[PDB]
């Protein structure tokens, strides 16, 4: 009862559709309204709520925000929420009193809260933004209330553990021996599709995909925000995720479609299908969905001889995951829900899904008069964002082959092309090794002179 007038204090405008939307259904009957949408002065306000604690939004907030404010623009405006004036007195004690009792104390305790959870679950904000820890700290160190005492102290904790985790591999059971085919170790020079085994193939490419999965946080998926101007800031984990996926695939192709002798192109073509076998024992449905996108390319798709030249249960194995994409992936999201962790996800399909929710959602429930900021929209992309998470937990009882790892995160099929320039170079070699006409396929020799026999993907070493 008294609050500051809003001239002093902008949280404090009425509540009207101007500036705040709340479902209005059978859920947001009884508990905590629900927030459709609002200012961001309102999504601030009801972040940091005198009357109730909303850890829900509170988690939200955190996971989406980056879509509608920068990490900057929020801690001004909590701090613009910590510093609120004292009412307009009546005329000349009493009211002074339960305002700092039942708004300032309760709103400042919510503020220190959400400077826990953002701390706590968001400090790559942090990382990636020294000036922003400097505020943060400052502020923090600022605050006296005798209340307020053991939040400073927990955040200062915090902050102490999270800084000390960027300065200072162990096995629940014994991880299955390395395996070798012609390739040996300290030789990365020899290191190929064709020579390494394709069973550690396999296994490095998982170890890598699972750690590079396992690096995403779903704030780099809110908003669409890895394909917008502060990509690099905001996505760094994904982006390099999806610039492995890139290169991985057009590797695929490239072993495929530069292989002009067609007996090595079909040895090519097995191998990557036993690639694609061991792939789907180790739940690796990312590498699975890799190979299948490099075989439905435009250049690799056209080589019905190499197809036609498979054997029938390689032809099947290939199939069969084939038909995991088809139909919005039905087949696909089946068999993920199936499976015992450890596994690695195809990303694909969350970046498919949250780029159409962006572009199938406003931004704004209207920019006429104020930015009203559609929150419901980043409550959807969340829940998305939310089944990231699940999976990022159960690491693999696999060893890392450090010269295998080396090779896979250097993988560079592009070279200095442009992706386009590669891959009208992938479609013009195609078109040479398997030409449009009813014609034999053409008979190039090898220029390598290794065995294309595969050791198979049995371990042998295993043993
Ligand atoms: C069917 C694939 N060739 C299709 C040929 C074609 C070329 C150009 C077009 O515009 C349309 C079709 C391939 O052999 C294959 C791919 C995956 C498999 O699991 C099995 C086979």
Redesign the pocket.
């Known amino acids: 009862l008294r609050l500051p007038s809003p001239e002093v204090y902008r949280f404090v405008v009425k509540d009207s559709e101007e500036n705040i939307v709340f479902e209005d259904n059978l859920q947001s009957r009884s508990g905590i309204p629900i927030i459709k949408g609002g200012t961001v002065v309102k999504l601030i306000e009801r972040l940091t709520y005198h009357m109730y604690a909303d850890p829900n939004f509170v988690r939200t907030f955190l996971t989406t925000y980056r879509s509608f404010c920068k990490p900057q623009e929020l801690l001004s405006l909590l701090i613009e929420r910590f510093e609120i004036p004292e009412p307009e007195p009546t005329d000349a004690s009493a009211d002074l009193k339960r305002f700092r009792k039942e708004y300032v104390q309760p709103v400042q305790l919510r503020i220190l809260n959400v400077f826990r959870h953002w701390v706590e679950h968001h400090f790559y904000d942090f990382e990636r933004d020294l000036y922003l820890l400097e505020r943060l700290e400052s502020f923090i160190s600022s605050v006296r209330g005798k209340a307020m005492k053991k939040w400073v102290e927990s955040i200062a904790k915090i902050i102490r553990r999270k800084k000390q985790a960027q300065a200072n591999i162990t096995f629940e059971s014994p991880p299955p021996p390395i395996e070798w085919h012609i390739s040996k170790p300290g030789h990365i020079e020899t290191f190929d599709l064709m020579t390494l085994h394709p069973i550690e193939i396999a296994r490095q490419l998982t170890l890598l995909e699972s750690d590079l999965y396992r690096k995403v946080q779903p704030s780099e998926l809110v908003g669409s925000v890895w394909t917008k101007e502060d990509k690099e800031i905001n996505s760094p984990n994904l982006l390099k995720m999806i610039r492995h996926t890139t290169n991985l695939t057009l590797w695929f192709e490239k072993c495929i479609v530069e292989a002009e002798n067609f007996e090595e192109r079909v040895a090519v073509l097995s191998r990557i299908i036993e690639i694609l076998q061991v792939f789907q024992d180790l739940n690796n449905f990312n590498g699975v969905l890799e190979i299948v996108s490099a ?2 390319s435009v250049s690799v ?4 001889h190499t ?2 030249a498979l054997q029938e249960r390689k ?1 099947k194995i ?2 069969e995951a ?1 038909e995991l994409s088809q139909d919005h992936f039905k087949k696909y999201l089946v068999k993920l829900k199936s499976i015992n962790p450890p596994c690695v996800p195809f990303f694909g399909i969350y970046l498919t899904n949250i780029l159409k929710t962006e572009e199938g959602n406003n931004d704004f429930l209207t920019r006429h008069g104020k930015d009203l900021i559609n929150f419901s929209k980043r409550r959807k992309v969340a829940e998305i964002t939310g089944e990231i998470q699940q999976y990022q937990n159960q690491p693999y009882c696999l060893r890392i082959e450090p010269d295998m790892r080396r090779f896979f995160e250097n993988l560079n099929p592009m070279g200095s092309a442009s992706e386009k320039e590669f891959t009208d170079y992938l479609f013009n070699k195609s078109l040479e090794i398997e030409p449009r006409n009813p014609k034999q396929p053409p008979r190039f020799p090898r220029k390598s002179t290794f065995s294309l026999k595969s050791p198979g993907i049995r371990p042998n070493t295993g043993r």
């Open positions: 075989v439905n798709y056209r080589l019905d197809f036609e032809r290939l199939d084939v």
